Ligand binder design. Structure first.
Ligand SMILES: COc1ccc2c(c1CN1CCNCC1)O/C(=C\c1n[nH]c3ccccc13)C2=O
Length: 264
């Protein structure tokens, strides 16, 4: 039913391959998830990732859609949308360096819309970062991938975390506790810094806990202010998604197709 192409990436979780749906030639990604490396299971018994993707794969959005899934004795196999041509945001930033603010604004806006969609669907991603964002290069559209560390959104504290440390908030580093929305906004602050500076702002636990943001590239005062707000040490000091999107730096965003024409 699927023609398997080259390996795209792998880890302890499993492995992801480029692929083609035989019936209509649709480009897909084929993600193999090892049963013994799934720490969080859900019910419809499946990986939480399948639960989460089904909850958000309803309709159009800036989330990669789950097309089908299969169970094997030792693994699940997930069939996911694959834009072509595509580049992840990490590779994009590696190649082009720090992004022009106009471009970072368009990208960051689309990520915000995607994350709002997840939260509105009861889903918390928990690993928002450049590597988990795909750019549909023809359309200038961004897509969130990899819900393998995610969880149902709740209003009470989380005490588990298996996303990316350097994108994790100081409350996690110190007390191994965080709330969903405010932890997400922290990771968004790390992401926006990464876009406009070309690298993440903190490498060690001590820098995260200190929370002093040093800008290594020229960044406008308005952008710096948004970033520093997202990276407030006190979780409750961080902006809501609404406050982020109403921030003066976020005004007059380019459309995705204009973004493609101008920058891609
Ligand atoms: C270590 O590599 C991983 C790990 C988890 C996932 C994954 C990959 C492959 N690459 C790794 C580098 N950044 C982009 C994704 O791709 C996923 C989903 C995809 N859905 N559609 C795609 C289309 C192209 C590439 C990846 C995907 C994952 O969940």
């Amino acid at each position: 039913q699927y023609q398997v192409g080259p390996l795209l990436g792998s880890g302890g979780f499993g492995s992801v391959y480029s692929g083609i749906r035989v019936s209509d030639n649709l480009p897909v990604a084929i993600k193999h998830v090892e049963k013994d490396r799934i720490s969080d299971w859900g019910e419809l018994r499946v990986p939480m990732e399948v639960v989460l993707l089904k909850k958000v794969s309803s309709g159009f959005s800036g989330v990669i859609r789950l097309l089908d899934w299969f169970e094997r004795p030792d693994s699940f196999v997930l069939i996911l949308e694959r834009p072509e041509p595509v580049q992840d945001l990490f590779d994009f930033i590696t190649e082009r360096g720090a992004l022009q603010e106009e471009l970072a604004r368009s990208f960051f806006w689309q990520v915000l819309e995607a994350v709002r969609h997840c939260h509105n669907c009861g889903v918390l991603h928990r690993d928002i970062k450049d590597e988990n964002i795909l750019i549909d290069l023809n359309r200038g559209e961004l897509k969130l991938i990899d819900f393998g560390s995610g969880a149902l959104l709740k209003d009470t504290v989380y005490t588990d975390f298996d996303g990316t440390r350097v994108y994790s908030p100081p409350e996690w580093i110190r007390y191994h506790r965080y709330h969903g929305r405010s932890a997400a906004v922290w990771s968004l602050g790390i992401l926006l810094y990464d876009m406009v500076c070309g690298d993440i702002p903190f490498e060690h636990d001590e820098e995260i806990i200190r929370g002093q943001v040093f800008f290594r590239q020229r960044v406008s005062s308005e952008c710096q202010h948004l970033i520093r707000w997202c990276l407030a040490l006190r979780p409750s000091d961080r902006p809501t998604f609404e406050e982020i999107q109403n921030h003066p730096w976020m005004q007059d965003v380019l459309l995705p197709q204009e973004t493609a024409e101008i920058h891609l």
